[PDB]
Amino acid sequence: RPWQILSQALGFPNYDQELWWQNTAETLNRVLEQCDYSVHLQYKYLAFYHKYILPSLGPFRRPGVEPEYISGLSHGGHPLEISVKIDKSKTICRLGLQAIGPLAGTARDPLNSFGDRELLKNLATLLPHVDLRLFDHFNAQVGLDRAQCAVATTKLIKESHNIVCTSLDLKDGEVIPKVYFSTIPKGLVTETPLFDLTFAAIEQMEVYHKDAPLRTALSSLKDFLRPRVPTDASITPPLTGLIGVDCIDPMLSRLKVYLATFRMDLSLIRDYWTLGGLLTDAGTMKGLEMVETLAKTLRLPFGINYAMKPGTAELAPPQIYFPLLGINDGFIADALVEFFQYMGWEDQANRYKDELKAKFPNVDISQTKNVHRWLGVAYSETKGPSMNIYYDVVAGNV
Amino acid sequence: RPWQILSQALGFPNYDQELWWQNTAETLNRVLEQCDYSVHLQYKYLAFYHKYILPSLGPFRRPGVEPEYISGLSHGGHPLEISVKIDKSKTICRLGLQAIGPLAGTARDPLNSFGDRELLKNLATLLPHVDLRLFDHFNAQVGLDRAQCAVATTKLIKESHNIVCTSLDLKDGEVIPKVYFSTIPKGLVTETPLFDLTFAAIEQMEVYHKDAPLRTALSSLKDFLRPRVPTDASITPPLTGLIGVDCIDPMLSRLKVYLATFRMDLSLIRDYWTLGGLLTDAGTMKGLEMVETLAKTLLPFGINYAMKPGTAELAPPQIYFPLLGINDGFIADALVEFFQYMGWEDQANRYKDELKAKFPNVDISQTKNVHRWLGVAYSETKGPSMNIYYDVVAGNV
Amino acid sequence: RPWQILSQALGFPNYDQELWWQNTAETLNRVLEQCDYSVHLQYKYLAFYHKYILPSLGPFRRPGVEPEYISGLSHGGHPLEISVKIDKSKTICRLGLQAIGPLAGTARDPLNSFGDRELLKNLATLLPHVDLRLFDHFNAQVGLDRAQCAVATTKLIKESHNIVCTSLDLKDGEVIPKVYFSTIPKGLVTETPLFDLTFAAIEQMEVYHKDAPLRTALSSLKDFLRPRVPTDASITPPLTGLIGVDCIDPMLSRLKVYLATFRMDLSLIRDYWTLGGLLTDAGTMKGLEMVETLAKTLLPFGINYAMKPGTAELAPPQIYFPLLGINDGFIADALVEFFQYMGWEDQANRYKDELKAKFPNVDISQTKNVHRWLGVAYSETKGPSMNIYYDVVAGNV
Amino acid sequence: RPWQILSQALGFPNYDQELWWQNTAETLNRVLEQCDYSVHLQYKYLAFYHKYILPSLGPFRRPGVEPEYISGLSHGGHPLEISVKIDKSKTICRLGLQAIGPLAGTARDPLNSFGDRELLKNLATLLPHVDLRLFDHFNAQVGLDRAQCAVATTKLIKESHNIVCTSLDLKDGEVIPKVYFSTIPKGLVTETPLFDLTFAAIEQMEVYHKDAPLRTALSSLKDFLRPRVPTDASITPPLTGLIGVDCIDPMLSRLKVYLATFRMDLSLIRDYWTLGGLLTDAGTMKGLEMVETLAKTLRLPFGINYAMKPGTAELAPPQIYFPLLGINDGFIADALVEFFQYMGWEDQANRYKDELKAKFPNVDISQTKNVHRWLGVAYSETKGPSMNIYYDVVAGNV
């Protein structure tokens, strides 16, 4: 098995990296197999993970070892998540993490401000298509200096001492990095409405100055969000909580504005999905029906993620993220099978439970309530409907 | 002794680091002593230099070893210079370098795009006042992706395959980093006038949007520069070739726009110094006299305009004279004469002996390489100041 | 100041290193000052400590963080002690530690078998006089393979999962390393009497084969020890529990055989001190008086016999009294009284104030942990000497 | 292809490691394929090579970069060799190298005294069967201090500034390390006959003191060597130039005494092979015939390597190493095919030339004279005849 062969060939520079491997790499090999990645790509991505991601994961939080930095990415405070994106034709795998610097959560680096950029730098030398210019732009506009990071830690719970996190799409051979920057620490430290600091940063992008369509699609999103998110500096929902970019050519990168909210019901789903009645086409409404039905078939906030691309003036429906923490995972798996049937993805319906068990062989998933963390649903004009399932891999292994 | 004591205590991770120490650290300790730094600051800066700078300097270019990356900072291609800033009351030391990444000058990193930031990151964890937000801003607006870097290396000589360089001011007990971003690679690759890509980047800064006085000073500067630098995408001097920032709180950082040109004569000096007749005060003119006299007593010339948030009015630039190719004994004689003109008699009396002490392995009467630049400035607050830049490796062999 | 200056200049690669500095380096600078080391040696040793020792110390055991490897060197399980060696004329400082590998105490490295050698290797490139041949010799003869290590951890408490430990004498301007190899793990795992595996290892040394006097001194020692330590494979005290060497030129290295025992009384002290009546001279007896008086004025006891190539005659051992569990204010009162007995009046006058200065964060009148060992020795050449070992972390919290 | 996939997944920490990969890893993948290693073992050994061996190879000597340390392992001064061991039933691959420390060939480490041990330490944490006790023993007895290493560099050519080298047998899944220690530097510095310093070190081994059979087989080898190698301190052939051990349990490790000599002819081959007429059995004579015929079918010295094992009192025939540097490689390949025919290994005969070309796709091997470096031949009582072919991999690639 590739995950075992790599463990035998490579070993580990320290015990925390060994623990990370023993609690994630079998699941990851299983995910990749299940997505129909060849043996050669299983080796490619597992080798990549060993080299680049293990040292980025910091100490492995366990009984008797409590790290200085606790991530909000998972239930046990581990800075890792693995997800699958399922559409009509294929399934791809994504890793999500926070790259932990070795002074993270101490006075020299209170919000873990360096590690993700250091990982990205290493990815830029590894991969020709990786471009750090958007990272740097948003790191400049929403990052904080050390004294501001210290202030921010006095206003935030320990699991939200973060400014950025990273996702790596493992798309048929390649690694595509994306990042999300949090707006809340700067909002809190500077007492600036989140809406305002989010669009001020976006509107300073070079590509925004160059690209009329991007500007127009943003102007439409702002008209939608302005009356719905706070106008004052409050941290109350719905709120613009993250800005996302792809770490590629900025002319090709999708810019994402992610809203966090607790309140959701069928009419709110319509509101977010259609942008308050702005989108009325057959495609949009067909996706709306899908999402309504997912919500029927089925604590962290809901997520609503609006994505825009240079060259496109019109907004598309967001991706909607359902929070599944606290909800029994056997129930989630029953719901998913039912939903996959509704979609007519019969193969997915027939495999989901067996594949789930196989992904997590050392825990009885029927008894957990923290292994499924999120379910994202999206509908594309061109590419079809898509579903993104996010797992707390360490919850599924310990 | 502090340089030797640190060498004995610490040793070296590899031979290139040992060669860098053996060819720079004695001079550096000498510079620090001569600026009246206490023994405790000598250990401070030298320990700092050993830990942070030696690994950033890359391979030590020498007979038989030709690095993949060659720096234009020095005559032998070594990415290092040491300078002193002399004013009425004190002398401070500064290090200038390019932090070399381990894949610099290869297909994975053609313009050495990563090393300086990696060094700055480690400084940010070392030093509470170090703020990387202005770095990241300009790296975003003037940096290039890998394919663009590769294109840029086909249009530029080996010694200009750079996007950024770093200075570290060793000022009282602190280290203050500054960086300069080059505009030429992005100008060449994108065919964008250097003037436009420079002010477009500056005008996207958050502090520019927040600060009315800064926006006023910049409009004055753009009025001055627009008719003087190219309006098309040519790399035709005079031109806006670097943007500089201090890696501190952006409300306190000085923004610098640096012009490069190969023509200088009295009429041009006056034009640059006074901003085309805008500055006419007794201060400005007392400085202009200095500069004219320096040029008489005596690589492109440099002209560096500096702006600070909160200040609407422009000051005279710093002007940089290239000294490469000119005998260093002559330079030292000229400087002694100039220091006499200034009435800095102490400096005049010490300069030649302190120079010899800085560089014991060379004889300055025979080199033309060791003095590389002379910067002269004047400000109303602080007085006249002079910056002398040395090729430390040239002075040591 | 030197400890603070180095902290400002260097910072820290990770938080465990920063915690080690914050809990040891001020005391260490205090010890060095008190031994009259010049400022330049203070920077020397402290810079050395920062670079070589901090990364060797592993994670800093603290509430919420429990390392996979726990050292028996200190009460809290930290692999560090600092000691002073006081004689008539001078006081020198020494560091004792276990260099922790990153997989120490896990299946890949159960007895921490690699870290000390890795540190010694880096010292050998740092220091021309450091010679690893005696290390490698004893590591070969008393070290264990992985399966044997795993067996040994099933037979030994967590705090005795070790094969070697290292001392660094900070003597004049140099660093002199020494190591001690434990015989017990190989004794337990192979069921070989400790006496036999100790002398078998020693008798295979090249210097033993080359040097007649050494072979004579060792035969005398074996005669003394054979009837006193176990002839079977028991771990029954008194026993030969460590072999020590200096990591220098094997012709100059002192070989040490260390006995551990839990019984001591006047008749045993005399028996160990005089080698069962072999040494009867005025020197030996003046030392025995010292030792008896120290025991009166006041973990196994230790008895350390030292031999040198070129010397056929045995000297009195160094005797180590365990002080764990005994009030440190009392210990300090006892030492002042003892130093008076010795006529070292300066030491008597400074001891309690210098102690307080070494450990400002604790109150010694209330701790029982800070003094860990007292070693006493006498030699005809050099006089009496006393070695006091402190749990530096206990003294700092 | 595994070597390419690993290059894509992993990249390189510096340019010298990248150059090492680009000039060795394709050949290595090709060797492993040709030895019938599965895809999973190709990944295992290539991943191992990337992690452990690349950083050990030091700077890649090339036009414009002349390292401080030059290895005598290859023609261009590169510290690497790859070999194949061919017997009746199978072929296995071995790597040979010198692990270069970062101060090697400078005043702080004149004979590269540290790097091999540092690599071995890392192998001991990677692999449970690795045992460093013999390494340490011989490092103690024949190693030199820094002042002695400096003296030795004044008496030795630059390519012989070495005290140890390492071989890694890639035997069906496992890595088995062996080392060879040079006796010449200590011989030169101390003015001690090589014979005497070699057997003095061996006779201090713990296993020698414990094992009557080992002692007896050594006593027989010494009776053979004493009248044939120098009695004074001269460095003249035949001489005992290396001591080899396996870095495993010392009760299982074969101890090797390697002789270097320039003069060889059929009667010398008999002398070495039979230990001066001591070995007269049918097996020995059948192997002698083989070796005579190899010599007929067919500058560095010849090697004669006597191997002994605890528990065995009787000596076996040595392995005899023919130096092939300077000899056209197309000629060597013709000779090998002819020899393989003589042996009746017809498959090897039919493949050798095509496989050779395929191992070295970027150089025309018919035109080189430095790619084959050594040919070792051995005959085993139990395991049969064996042939070891050593290649200068960098010579075959640049």
mmCIF file with all atom_site columns, C-alpha atoms in Angstrom, chain D residues 258-394:
data_model
loop_
_atom_site.group_PDB
_atom_site.id
_atom_site.type_symbol
_atom_site.label_atom_id
_atom_site.label_alt_id
_atom_site.label_comp_id
_atom_site.label_asym_id
_atom_site.label_entity_id
_atom_site.label_seq_id
_atom_site.pdbx_PDB_ins_code
_atom_site.Cartn_x
_atom_site.Cartn_y
_atom_site.Cartn_z
_atom_site.occupancy
_atom_site.B_iso_or_equiv
_atom_site.pdbx_formal_charge
_atom_site.auth_seq_id
_atom_site.auth_comp_id
_atom_site.auth_asym_id
_atom_site.auth_atom_id
_atom_site.pdbx_PDB_model_num
ATOM 1   C CA . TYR D 1 258 ? 40.214 -6.227  1.113   1.00 0.00 ? 258 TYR D CA 1
ATOM 2   C CA . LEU D 1 259 ? 43.609 -6.396  -0.654  1.00 0.00 ? 259 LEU D CA 1
ATOM 3   C CA . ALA D 1 260 ? 44.638 -3.957  -3.416  1.00 0.00 ? 260 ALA D CA 1
ATOM 4   C CA . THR D 1 261 ? 47.240 -5.005  -5.966  1.00 0.00 ? 261 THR D CA 1
ATOM 5   C CA . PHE D 1 262 ? 48.271 -4.079  -9.553  1.00 0.00 ? 262 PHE D CA 1
ATOM 6   C CA . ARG D 1 263 ? 49.905 -7.328  -10.572 1.00 0.00 ? 263 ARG D CA 1
ATOM 7   C CA . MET D 1 264 ? 47.602 -10.154 -11.635 1.00 0.00 ? 264 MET D CA 1
ATOM 8   C CA . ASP D 1 265 ? 48.051 -13.143 -13.960 1.00 0.00 ? 265 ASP D CA 1
ATOM 9   C CA . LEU D 1 266 ? 46.689 -16.646 -13.930 1.00 0.00 ? 266 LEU D CA 1
ATOM 10  C CA . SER D 1 267 ? 49.030 -18.027 -11.265 1.00 0.00 ? 267 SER D CA 1
ATOM 11  C CA . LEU D 1 268 ? 48.280 -15.013 -8.945  1.00 0.00 ? 268 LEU D CA 1
ATOM 12  C CA . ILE D 1 269 ? 44.592 -15.543 -9.421  1.00 0.00 ? 269 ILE D CA 1
ATOM 13  C CA . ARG D 1 270 ? 45.110 -19.195 -8.274  1.00 0.00 ? 270 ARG D CA 1
ATOM 14  C CA . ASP D 1 271 ? 47.206 -18.083 -5.307  1.00 0.00 ? 271 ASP D CA 1
ATOM 15  C CA . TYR D 1 272 ? 44.549 -15.611 -4.080  1.00 0.00 ? 272 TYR D CA 1
ATOM 16  C CA . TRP D 1 273 ? 41.599 -17.717 -4.888  1.00 0.00 ? 273 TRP D CA 1
ATOM 17  C CA . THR D 1 274 ? 42.875 -20.895 -3.160  1.00 0.00 ? 274 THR D CA 1
ATOM 18  C CA . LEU D 1 275 ? 44.783 -19.166 -0.385  1.00 0.00 ? 275 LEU D CA 1
ATOM 19  C CA . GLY D 1 276 ? 48.118 -20.508 -1.547  1.00 0.00 ? 276 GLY D CA 1
ATOM 20  C CA . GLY D 1 277 ? 46.799 -24.057 -1.994  1.00 0.00 ? 277 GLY D CA 1
ATOM 21  C CA . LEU D 1 278 ? 44.857 -24.190 1.284   1.00 0.00 ? 278 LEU D CA 1
ATOM 22  C CA . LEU D 1 279 ? 41.529 -24.603 -0.492  1.00 0.00 ? 279 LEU D CA 1
ATOM 23  C CA . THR D 1 280 ? 41.522 -27.583 -2.843  1.00 0.00 ? 280 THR D CA 1
ATOM 24  C CA . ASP D 1 281 ? 37.866 -28.762 -2.924  1.00 0.00 ? 281 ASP D CA 1
ATOM 25  C CA . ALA D 1 282 ? 35.724 -29.270 -6.081  1.00 0.00 ? 282 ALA D CA 1
ATOM 26  C CA . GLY D 1 283 ? 33.697 -26.110 -5.438  1.00 0.00 ? 283 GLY D CA 1
ATOM 27  C CA . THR D 1 284 ? 36.771 -23.899 -5.134  1.00 0.00 ? 284 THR D CA 1
ATOM 28  C CA . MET D 1 285 ? 38.305 -25.355 -8.274  1.00 0.00 ? 285 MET D CA 1
ATOM 29  C CA . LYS D 1 286 ? 35.075 -24.920 -10.252 1.00 0.00 ? 286 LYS D CA 1
ATOM 30  C CA . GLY D 1 287 ? 35.012 -21.250 -9.257  1.00 0.00 ? 287 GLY D CA 1
ATOM 31  C CA . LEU D 1 288 ? 38.718 -20.958 -10.065 1.00 0.00 ? 288 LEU D CA 1
ATOM 32  C CA . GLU D 1 289 ? 37.989 -22.119 -13.598 1.00 0.00 ? 289 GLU D CA 1
ATOM 33  C CA . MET D 1 290 ? 35.265 -19.441 -13.900 1.00 0.00 ? 290 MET D CA 1
ATOM 34  C CA . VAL D 1 291 ? 37.542 -16.659 -12.777 1.00 0.00 ? 291 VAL D CA 1
ATOM 35  C CA . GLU D 1 292 ? 40.417 -17.760 -15.041 1.00 0.00 ? 292 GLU D CA 1
ATOM 36  C CA . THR D 1 293 ? 38.011 -17.652 -17.974 1.00 0.00 ? 293 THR D CA 1
ATOM 37  C CA . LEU D 1 294 ? 36.720 -14.221 -17.023 1.00 0.00 ? 294 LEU D CA 1
ATOM 38  C CA . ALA D 1 295 ? 40.271 -12.978 -16.947 1.00 0.00 ? 295 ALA D CA 1
ATOM 39  C CA . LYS D 1 296 ? 40.916 -14.467 -20.393 1.00 0.00 ? 296 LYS D CA 1
ATOM 40  C CA . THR D 1 297 ? 37.752 -13.061 -21.928 1.00 0.00 ? 297 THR D CA 1
ATOM 41  C CA . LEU D 1 298 ? 38.782 -9.525  -20.659 1.00 0.00 ? 298 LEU D CA 1
ATOM 42  C CA . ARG D 1 299 ? 44.456 2.403   -14.007 1.00 0.00 ? 299 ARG D CA 1
ATOM 43  C CA . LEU D 1 300 ? 42.870 1.103   -10.700 1.00 0.00 ? 300 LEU D CA 1
ATOM 44  C CA . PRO D 1 301 ? 44.230 -1.803  -8.686  1.00 0.00 ? 301 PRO D CA 1
ATOM 45  C CA . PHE D 1 302 ? 42.693 -5.293  -8.718  1.00 0.00 ? 302 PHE D CA 1
ATOM 46  C CA . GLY D 1 303 ? 40.753 -6.032  -5.528  1.00 0.00 ? 303 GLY D CA 1
ATOM 47  C CA . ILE D 1 304 ? 40.757 -9.277  -3.553  1.00 0.00 ? 304 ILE D CA 1
ATOM 48  C CA . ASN D 1 305 ? 38.085 -9.359  -0.821  1.00 0.00 ? 305 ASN D CA 1
ATOM 49  C CA . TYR D 1 306 ? 38.143 -12.139 1.866   1.00 0.00 ? 306 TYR D CA 1
ATOM 50  C CA . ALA D 1 307 ? 34.894 -12.375 3.803   1.00 0.00 ? 307 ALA D CA 1
ATOM 51  C CA . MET D 1 308 ? 34.403 -14.058 7.178   1.00 0.00 ? 308 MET D CA 1
ATOM 52  C CA . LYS D 1 309 ? 31.443 -14.652 9.439   1.00 0.00 ? 309 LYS D CA 1
ATOM 53  C CA . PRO D 1 310 ? 31.221 -15.358 13.102  1.00 0.00 ? 310 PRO D CA 1
ATOM 54  C CA . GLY D 1 311 ? 30.587 -19.085 13.583  1.00 0.00 ? 311 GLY D CA 1
ATOM 55  C CA . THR D 1 312 ? 32.567 -20.192 10.480  1.00 0.00 ? 312 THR D CA 1
ATOM 56  C CA . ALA D 1 313 ? 36.196 -21.368 11.128  1.00 0.00 ? 313 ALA D CA 1
ATOM 57  C CA . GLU D 1 314 ? 37.112 -22.088 7.552   1.00 0.00 ? 314 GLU D CA 1
ATOM 58  C CA . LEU D 1 315 ? 37.923 -19.518 4.831   1.00 0.00 ? 315 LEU D CA 1
ATOM 59  C CA . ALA D 1 316 ? 36.085 -19.383 1.499   1.00 0.00 ? 316 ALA D CA 1
ATOM 60  C CA . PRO D 1 317 ? 37.492 -18.081 -1.828  1.00 0.00 ? 317 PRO D CA 1
ATOM 61  C CA . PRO D 1 318 ? 37.606 -14.268 -2.013  1.00 0.00 ? 318 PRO D CA 1
ATOM 62  C CA . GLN D 1 319 ? 35.604 -12.061 -4.325  1.00 0.00 ? 319 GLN D CA 1
ATOM 63  C CA . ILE D 1 320 ? 37.973 -10.838 -7.059  1.00 0.00 ? 320 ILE D CA 1
ATOM 64  C CA . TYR D 1 321 ? 37.428 -7.334  -8.481  1.00 0.00 ? 321 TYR D CA 1
ATOM 65  C CA . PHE D 1 322 ? 38.647 -6.559  -12.032 1.00 0.00 ? 322 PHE D CA 1
ATOM 66  C CA . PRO D 1 323 ? 39.234 -2.805  -12.677 1.00 0.00 ? 323 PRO D CA 1
ATOM 67  C CA . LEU D 1 324 ? 37.647 -1.709  -15.875 1.00 0.00 ? 324 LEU D CA 1
ATOM 68  C CA . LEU D 1 325 ? 38.419 2.041   -15.861 1.00 0.00 ? 325 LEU D CA 1
ATOM 69  C CA . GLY D 1 326 ? 40.083 3.051   -19.182 1.00 0.00 ? 326 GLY D CA 1
ATOM 70  C CA . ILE D 1 327 ? 38.710 0.095   -21.030 1.00 0.00 ? 327 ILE D CA 1
ATOM 71  C CA . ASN D 1 328 ? 36.177 0.669   -23.764 1.00 0.00 ? 328 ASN D CA 1
ATOM 72  C CA . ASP D 1 329 ? 32.669 -0.090  -22.492 1.00 0.00 ? 329 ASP D CA 1
ATOM 73  C CA . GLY D 1 330 ? 31.461 -1.642  -25.723 1.00 0.00 ? 330 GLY D CA 1
ATOM 74  C CA . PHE D 1 331 ? 34.326 -4.132  -25.463 1.00 0.00 ? 331 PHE D CA 1
ATOM 75  C CA . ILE D 1 332 ? 33.342 -4.795  -21.842 1.00 0.00 ? 332 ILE D CA 1
ATOM 76  C CA . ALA D 1 333 ? 29.810 -5.417  -22.816 1.00 0.00 ? 333 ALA D CA 1
ATOM 77  C CA . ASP D 1 334 ? 30.922 -7.902  -25.633 1.00 0.00 ? 334 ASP D CA 1
ATOM 78  C CA . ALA D 1 335 ? 33.143 -9.694  -23.075 1.00 0.00 ? 335 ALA D CA 1
ATOM 79  C CA . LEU D 1 336 ? 30.282 -9.943  -20.575 1.00 0.00 ? 336 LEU D CA 1
ATOM 80  C CA . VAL D 1 337 ? 27.913 -11.440 -23.094 1.00 0.00 ? 337 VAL D CA 1
ATOM 81  C CA . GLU D 1 338 ? 30.613 -13.995 -23.982 1.00 0.00 ? 338 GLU D CA 1
ATOM 82  C CA . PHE D 1 339 ? 31.170 -14.777 -20.292 1.00 0.00 ? 339 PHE D CA 1
ATOM 83  C CA . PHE D 1 340 ? 27.476 -15.065 -19.540 1.00 0.00 ? 340 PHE D CA 1
ATOM 84  C CA . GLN D 1 341 ? 27.311 -17.611 -22.404 1.00 0.00 ? 341 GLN D CA 1
ATOM 85  C CA . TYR D 1 342 ? 30.171 -19.575 -20.899 1.00 0.00 ? 342 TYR D CA 1
ATOM 86  C CA . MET D 1 343 ? 28.160 -19.658 -17.603 1.00 0.00 ? 343 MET D CA 1
ATOM 87  C CA . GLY D 1 344 ? 25.058 -20.725 -19.398 1.00 0.00 ? 344 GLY D CA 1
ATOM 88  C CA . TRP D 1 345 ? 23.141 -17.665 -18.149 1.00 0.00 ? 345 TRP D CA 1
ATOM 89  C CA . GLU D 1 346 ? 21.604 -17.283 -21.585 1.00 0.00 ? 346 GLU D CA 1
ATOM 90  C CA . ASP D 1 347 ? 18.936 -14.744 -20.645 1.00 0.00 ? 347 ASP D CA 1
ATOM 91  C CA . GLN D 1 348 ? 21.627 -12.397 -19.264 1.00 0.00 ? 348 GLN D CA 1
ATOM 92  C CA . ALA D 1 349 ? 23.644 -12.898 -22.409 1.00 0.00 ? 349 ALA D CA 1
ATOM 93  C CA . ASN D 1 350 ? 20.653 -11.987 -24.579 1.00 0.00 ? 350 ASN D CA 1
ATOM 94  C CA . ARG D 1 351 ? 19.697 -8.855  -22.611 1.00 0.00 ? 351 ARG D CA 1
ATOM 95  C CA . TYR D 1 352 ? 22.932 -7.327  -21.446 1.00 0.00 ? 352 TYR D CA 1
ATOM 96  C CA . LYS D 1 353 ? 23.589 -4.916  -24.276 1.00 0.00 ? 353 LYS D CA 1
ATOM 97  C CA . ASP D 1 354 ? 20.052 -3.738  -24.719 1.00 0.00 ? 354 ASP D CA 1
ATOM 98  C CA . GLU D 1 355 ? 19.638 -3.258  -20.954 1.00 0.00 ? 355 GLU D CA 1
ATOM 99  C CA . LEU D 1 356 ? 22.894 -1.399  -20.739 1.00 0.00 ? 356 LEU D CA 1
ATOM 100 C CA . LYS D 1 357 ? 21.818 1.041   -23.406 1.00 0.00 ? 357 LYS D CA 1
ATOM 101 C CA . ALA D 1 358 ? 18.509 1.509   -21.658 1.00 0.00 ? 358 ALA D CA 1
ATOM 102 C CA . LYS D 1 359 ? 20.225 2.134   -18.247 1.00 0.00 ? 359 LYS D CA 1
ATOM 103 C CA . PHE D 1 360 ? 22.252 5.015   -19.848 1.00 0.00 ? 360 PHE D CA 1
ATOM 104 C CA . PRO D 1 361 ? 19.978 6.660   -22.430 1.00 0.00 ? 361 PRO D CA 1
ATOM 105 C CA . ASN D 1 362 ? 21.810 9.992   -22.609 1.00 0.00 ? 362 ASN D CA 1
ATOM 106 C CA . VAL D 1 363 ? 25.292 8.780   -23.399 1.00 0.00 ? 363 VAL D CA 1
ATOM 107 C CA . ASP D 1 364 ? 26.519 6.465   -26.151 1.00 0.00 ? 364 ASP D CA 1
ATOM 108 C CA . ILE D 1 365 ? 28.127 3.794   -23.952 1.00 0.00 ? 365 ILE D CA 1
ATOM 109 C CA . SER D 1 366 ? 29.936 2.231   -27.009 1.00 0.00 ? 366 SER D CA 1
ATOM 110 C CA . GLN D 1 367 ? 32.113 5.352   -27.013 1.00 0.00 ? 367 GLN D CA 1
ATOM 111 C CA . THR D 1 368 ? 32.930 5.600   -23.308 1.00 0.00 ? 368 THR D CA 1
ATOM 112 C CA . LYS D 1 369 ? 35.694 3.998   -21.316 1.00 0.00 ? 369 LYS D CA 1
ATOM 113 C CA . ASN D 1 370 ? 34.645 5.034   -17.761 1.00 0.00 ? 370 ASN D CA 1
ATOM 114 C CA . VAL D 1 371 ? 31.062 3.747   -17.255 1.00 0.00 ? 371 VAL D CA 1
ATOM 115 C CA . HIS D 1 372 ? 31.948 0.206   -16.233 1.00 0.00 ? 372 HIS D CA 1
ATOM 116 C CA . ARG D 1 373 ? 34.256 0.630   -13.277 1.00 0.00 ? 373 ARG D CA 1
ATOM 117 C CA . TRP D 1 374 ? 34.580 -2.782  -11.657 1.00 0.00 ? 374 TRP D CA 1
ATOM 118 C CA . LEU D 1 375 ? 33.567 -6.330  -12.174 1.00 0.00 ? 375 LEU D CA 1
ATOM 119 C CA . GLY D 1 376 ? 33.448 -8.530  -9.110  1.00 0.00 ? 376 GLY D CA 1
ATOM 120 C CA . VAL D 1 377 ? 33.254 -12.297 -9.311  1.00 0.00 ? 377 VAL D CA 1
ATOM 121 C CA . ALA D 1 378 ? 32.528 -14.726 -6.466  1.00 0.00 ? 378 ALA D CA 1
ATOM 122 C CA . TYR D 1 379 ? 31.601 -18.298 -6.036  1.00 0.00 ? 379 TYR D CA 1
ATOM 123 C CA . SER D 1 380 ? 29.522 -19.482 -3.106  1.00 0.00 ? 380 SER D CA 1
ATOM 124 C CA . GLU D 1 381 ? 29.359 -22.972 -1.662  1.00 0.00 ? 381 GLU D CA 1
ATOM 125 C CA . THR D 1 382 ? 25.623 -22.683 -1.148  1.00 0.00 ? 382 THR D CA 1
ATOM 126 C CA . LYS D 1 383 ? 24.406 -19.691 -3.256  1.00 0.00 ? 383 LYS D CA 1
ATOM 127 C CA . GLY D 1 384 ? 26.349 -20.390 -6.570  1.00 0.00 ? 384 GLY D CA 1
ATOM 128 C CA . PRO D 1 385 ? 28.477 -17.977 -8.762  1.00 0.00 ? 385 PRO D CA 1
ATOM 129 C CA . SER D 1 386 ? 27.763 -14.234 -8.643  1.00 0.00 ? 386 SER D CA 1
ATOM 130 C CA . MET D 1 387 ? 28.822 -11.304 -10.571 1.00 0.00 ? 387 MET D CA 1
ATOM 131 C CA . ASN D 1 388 ? 28.863 -7.709  -9.406  1.00 0.00 ? 388 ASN D CA 1
ATOM 132 C CA . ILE D 1 389 ? 29.063 -4.938  -11.997 1.00 0.00 ? 389 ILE D CA 1
ATOM 133 C CA . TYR D 1 390 ? 29.835 -1.415  -10.733 1.00 0.00 ? 390 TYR D CA 1
ATOM 134 C CA . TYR D 1 391 ? 28.886 1.595   -12.821 1.00 0.00 ? 391 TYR D CA 1
ATOM 135 C CA . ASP D 1 392 ? 29.945 5.278   -12.652 1.00 0.00 ? 392 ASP D CA 1
ATOM 136 C CA . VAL D 1 393 ? 26.427 6.465   -12.992 1.00 0.00 ? 393 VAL D CA 1
ATOM 137 C CA . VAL D 1 394 ? 27.309 10.130  -13.459 1.00 0.00 ? 394 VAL D CA 1
#
